[PDB]
Design a protein around this ligand. Structure first.
Ligand SMILES: C=CCN(C)CCCCCCOc1ccc2c(-c3ccc(Br)cc3)nccc2c1
Ligand SMILES: C=CCN(C)CCCCCCOc1ccc2c(-c3ccc(Br)cc3)nccc2c1
Ligand SMILES: CCCCCCCCOCCOCCOCCOCCO
Ligand SMILES: CCCCCCCCOCCOCCOCCOCCO
Lengths: 619, 619
């Protein structure tokens, strides 16, 4: 039956492999990436008319009939996103009359205008001079002085936030304005009666911070700020030290853009970091077949390559397949051997992790490290010396990263402070990196592949971690994947791996929850709305990836025979394309719960292959 | 007569122009550049077997019949240079038996061996493990803490020494060792009886510094050095902030190499700065037609371009000639508009100078700025707006750089401290950048082209400076050019330009001195030995460039009619090649009096052209 399905998927995946030996599917997000790129180009005075064109085509192509844009396909209109998209289009050349402009402008106004937008959106506008800097939450360069132990020192913020903050403190320190030509001014973003419905910090606006921010904006006003020139040079030096090999900063779109702006601010455009910073951008861009061009919020080569290998194995190719070997080799040259920001809390830990992107040594993550180490463990490469050593280095790095509560975070250990969540600036996404269920599960299944189990204290703490975190209904949250089906799929798959007993009560209570959501069409799906309204936990249009997740929980929990199981397998088998792939017009990946979603374009292919190989495995 | 000479010189000069519009002759020095390159490649573990071949080929080619190498062609053998050359060749592959190696080992031994070499040479050896680090003068990263006003703070050292020091302080901080394979160990450098004749600091060893060095070497021994980790990061940050666009550091070979080593030291090979620093090297290398390869101590495009223009004008081409225009334009895009290290002593000075090389924004120099500004002032470019503005900025920057005594240094204002000259480490070359006669002369002739004169305070102080510096015999020293003919040629040329009277006594006393040294062949020459032994002042084989310098002093002083003058012109006319060039197998350029000489390969063509055009001018 499914045999042919799997056989076709395998040859498909094997076809998508790049020459050097890795897999790399584009990462999808929302249009703020390209909208901000347009503004960035204006700031830096490097606008390519041809490029703007491809971006115009893209922006429009992404707009929906109602004239809005969303965080994910089939999602509610997003005010922030739509505002930026508007400004972008207007700049590129479209007049406010045009149908597209009109519908958008309407949505925007019916929402209270610009005053209802997140800090980032008002700050971008602040940069081009379409909004008062005085109304934008300050993050002073002095932040650079707070030492290792102290409220709000930069290491209390998560890796992604950290860099962004350092970068911005230079920007906000100078509050510069790069005027838009008259044709593009967007005063209409104010023309509304609807009362501004302001969004507050991700944790609550304690009156102290409102005061503190008011103080800072006042201190901005003064004629002299002692030691500020130094606070700035601190920020700058902090950035020069960590710039990634590809010219970016963290391999992510935000700080990369803000750093380039800061460099421009400091009259440093003729400097090596700026140049390399700028030219590196092209690697993240993508030529869309319909004449458009998008920019990736980040790139996922390691991740893709890691899972690709794991699936192609569970499927059936031999641990020494000449094709998997190329992958295994490539992965070995990616291991990070130098200390990164993580070392600030673990000075005596031997580096051995990996990163999401191609070259980003200072920010390896647990998830990628666990997947890569595990995936390697399943291969047989020529140099058995290196495979052995690398795993070892990576293995230990992971262990050494295990946070206090027994669970693993992504970038740091115990980056669990609560303080950062309350400042004015932090109104969008996460801002700290606490441990999560999904990463922990992946770490756990990593170890399990080796043969470690319940006995070893390490695991024990993790499992206890996972158990205290299970939701009432038996489900597990999904931090970096959408959502309960993602988490649950992982946890159960993991626990099975570390030797626990699939028969225990809470394991069953989870296994049951899965079956209870199988959609009529014999597969599973979960819409991104499940981060906002709980009515959507387990609910959504059936996707190939989420189906595979559910199937894995089922297969791990012993219920491979179950009807739900077979039914699921049917879905993946019927919905497969003639070439081997699977489509998936929905995002099944998470950036930040409620605020930012991602579409891992390889998930649709890899997980179904992996889930199927595991079904065949249990027979 | 000379008309044809001049015509052929022009069409030749014009032929050497590059497309983008500038001139760029290779800069010649000594083999320590290539020898150190070889060791650097070993340190960085990036040895190209083919490149080594082209290097072995050059190294041998430059060795004299006696088996030694010198600082300049036709010069005494140099211990330092020969030692490094030796080690380089041994590493590349030649055994200590070979004819060339034997002769060399002899000279080296007859001198007291390795113990008689400069700090830099023992330090390079120290790096590959062929010499105890304990015997190498220390320069601690803590140097980084000394503030603006304090003995030995880094801004008390000249621009070139500064960067080198910062770089090395990280290296000496860690005292690393990159062992040579056994085949290349060079213990024989010790095998000698001749008593070591140690070279001391450029100014004398005050017992304080020996004490200080001895303490510093003892402190190295300790198990913990508080605040050192900071000191290091201070140096690295100072270094990452100043890297040149071409990836170098200061556009000179020394700090560039040391910085790369320090980055290697700091486990930062996959950092943007390291990568750029490494790949930038190629631009400085040169393929020699006989199969060898050399590395330039530095590059002189701006300088070459500036003089080229000035000569082709004095020569006869129209101030709007299309070729000189390409040049004028190119020169405008080179003006530096941001502040450099010089601003530390002149915070309110508007940047507007130029550099020697292509892209080196933090280190513009008075000499290049004066020549470029002056040259621009003789052209008529399309955008007269920009020529007008550029000159004004350059002009004012120069004025703002005039040191206390009334003269001009090359990179800084009053970099006249005497303290640095006594520390153990400083045993080779200059280490501070005090004002010099030749740069001042050039600045003066620059203003003169605009018409300013004796009445403007600025010029008055400068002339008073030059007068207090004239030598007893009426000659003027040559800091950056070889030597008394270079300086005298300039001063007289300058003073004539600022309106002073060529009839005054001291002007005549100098003019006379020039005629006094005309060689029998009706031209002038001055050997590099004149920095060591005064019996060589004005004496040496005739060279085309030095002839031109003498001729300019003669022409400026009114004695164009003079027999010496005519005779000189005869020389330049008889010795000219069929194509229009002129040969010159001697170095006529100075790096550091006594210690480092340069061969500006364009001098032989440009000055004779300039001199001749000025002869024709006065008729
Ligand atoms: C599942 C395993 C792979 N790991 C590796 C997770 C991959 C997620 C990294 C890609 C997303 O990176 C970011 C990180 C921060 C982002 C921010 C952001 C938000 C708040 C602050 Br304050 C600063 C930046 N804004 C917009 C987009 C972003 C994408
Ligand atoms: C004449 C007009 C152009 N100006 C612009 C002068 C051009 C000279 C710059 C090229 C030489 O640059 C250097 C500078 C320093 C050099 C050092 C050196 C010596 C002692 C220390 Br302490 C550090 C470096 N060693 C070896 C070689 C060098 C060449
Ligand atoms: C630069 C001094 C050498 C410091 C030794 C390396 C130890 C660094 O401490 C780790 C924690 O600091 C955060 C990031 O390190 C990454 C980039 O800094 C690079 C230079 O070390
Ligand atoms: C970095 C914030 C300081 C901004 C003021 C610019 C003043 C720079 O000082 C000039 C002299 O200092 C040495 C070098 O300057 C070059 C590199 O520093 C770059 C960023 O300014």
């Amino acid at each position: 039956a499914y045999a042919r399905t799997l056989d076709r998927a395998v040859e498909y995946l094997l076809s998508c492999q790049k020459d050097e030996g890795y897999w790399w599917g584009p990462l999808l997000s929302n249009v703020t990436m390209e909208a901000e790129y347009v503004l960035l180009c204006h700031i830096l005075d490097r606008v390519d008319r041809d490029r703007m064109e491809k971006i115009r085509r893209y922006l429009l192509h992404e707009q929906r009939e109602d004239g809005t844009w969303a965080l994910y396909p089939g999602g509610p209109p997003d005010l922030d996103t739509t505002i930026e998209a508007y400004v972008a289009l207007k700049y590129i050349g479209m007049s406010r009359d045009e149908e597209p402009m009109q519908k958008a402008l309407r949505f925007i106004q019916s929402q209270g205008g610009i005053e209802s937008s997140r800090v980032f959106t008002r700050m971008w506008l602040a940069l081009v001079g379409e909004y008062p800097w005085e109304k934008v939450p300050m993050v002073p360069p002095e932040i650079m002085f707070l030492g290792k132990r102290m409220p709000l020192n930069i290491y209390e913020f998560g890796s992604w936030a950290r860099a962004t903050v350092v970068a911005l403190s230079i920007v906000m320190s100078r509050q510069p304005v790069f005027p838009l030509p008259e044709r593009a001014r967007v005063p209409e973003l104010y023309e509304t009666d609807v009362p501004p419905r302001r969004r507050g910090a991700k944790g609550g606006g304690g009156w102290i911070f409102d005061a503190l921010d008011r103080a800072l904006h006042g201190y901005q006003k003064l004629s002299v700020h002692p030691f500020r020139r130094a606070a700035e040079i601190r920020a700058l030096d902090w950035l020069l030290e960590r710039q990634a090999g590809d010219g970016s900063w963290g391999g992510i779109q935000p700080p990369w853009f803000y750093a380039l702006i800061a460099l421009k601010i400091l009259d440093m455009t003729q400097h090596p970091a700026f140049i390399k910073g700028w030219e590196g951008l092209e690697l993240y861009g993508v030529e869309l077949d319909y004449g458009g061009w998008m920019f990736q919020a980040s790139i996922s080569p390691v991740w893709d390559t890691g899972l690709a290998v794991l699936a192609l194995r569970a499927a059936g190719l031999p641990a020494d397949h000449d094709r998997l070997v190329k992958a295994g080799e490539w992965l070995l040259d990616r291991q990070i051997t130098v200390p990164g920001d993580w070392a600030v809390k673990r000075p005596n830990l031997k580096p051995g992790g990996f990163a999401f992107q191609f070259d980003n040594v200072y920010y390896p993550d647990v998830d990628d490290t666990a997947v890569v180490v595990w995936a390697l463990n399943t291969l047989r490469l020529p140099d058995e010396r290196r495979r052995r050593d690398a795993m070892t280095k990576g293995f230990r790095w992971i262990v050494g990263m295990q946070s206090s509560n027994g669970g693993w975070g992504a970038y740091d250990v115990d980056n669990t402070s609560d303080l950062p969540n309350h400042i004015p600036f932090c109104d969008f996404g996460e801002v700290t990196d606490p441990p999560s269920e999904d990463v922990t599960a992946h770490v756990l299944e990593c170890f399990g592949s080796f043969g470690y189990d319940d006995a070893w204290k390490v695991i024990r703490r993790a499992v206890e971690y996972l158990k205290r975190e299970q939701k009432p209904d038996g489900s597990w949250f999904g931090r970096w994947g959408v959502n309960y089906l993602y988490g649950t799929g992982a946890v159960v798959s993991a626990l099975k791996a570390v030797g626990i007993d699939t028969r225990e009560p809470y394991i069953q209570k989870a296994l049951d929850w899965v079956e209870q959501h199988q959609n009529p069409d014999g597969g599973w799906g979960e819409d991104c709305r499940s981060y906002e309204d709980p009515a959507y936990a387990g609910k959504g249009a059936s996707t190939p990836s989420q189906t595979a997740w559910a199937l894995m929980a089922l297969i791990a929990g012993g219920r491979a025979e179950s009807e739900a199981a077979r039914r699921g397998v049917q879905y993946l088998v019927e919905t497969q394309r003639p070439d081997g792939g699977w489509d998936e017009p929905y995002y099944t990946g998470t950036g930040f719960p409620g605020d930012f979603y991602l579409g891992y374009t390889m998930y649709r292919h890899v997980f179904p292959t992996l889930a199927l190989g595991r079904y065949k495995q249990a027979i």
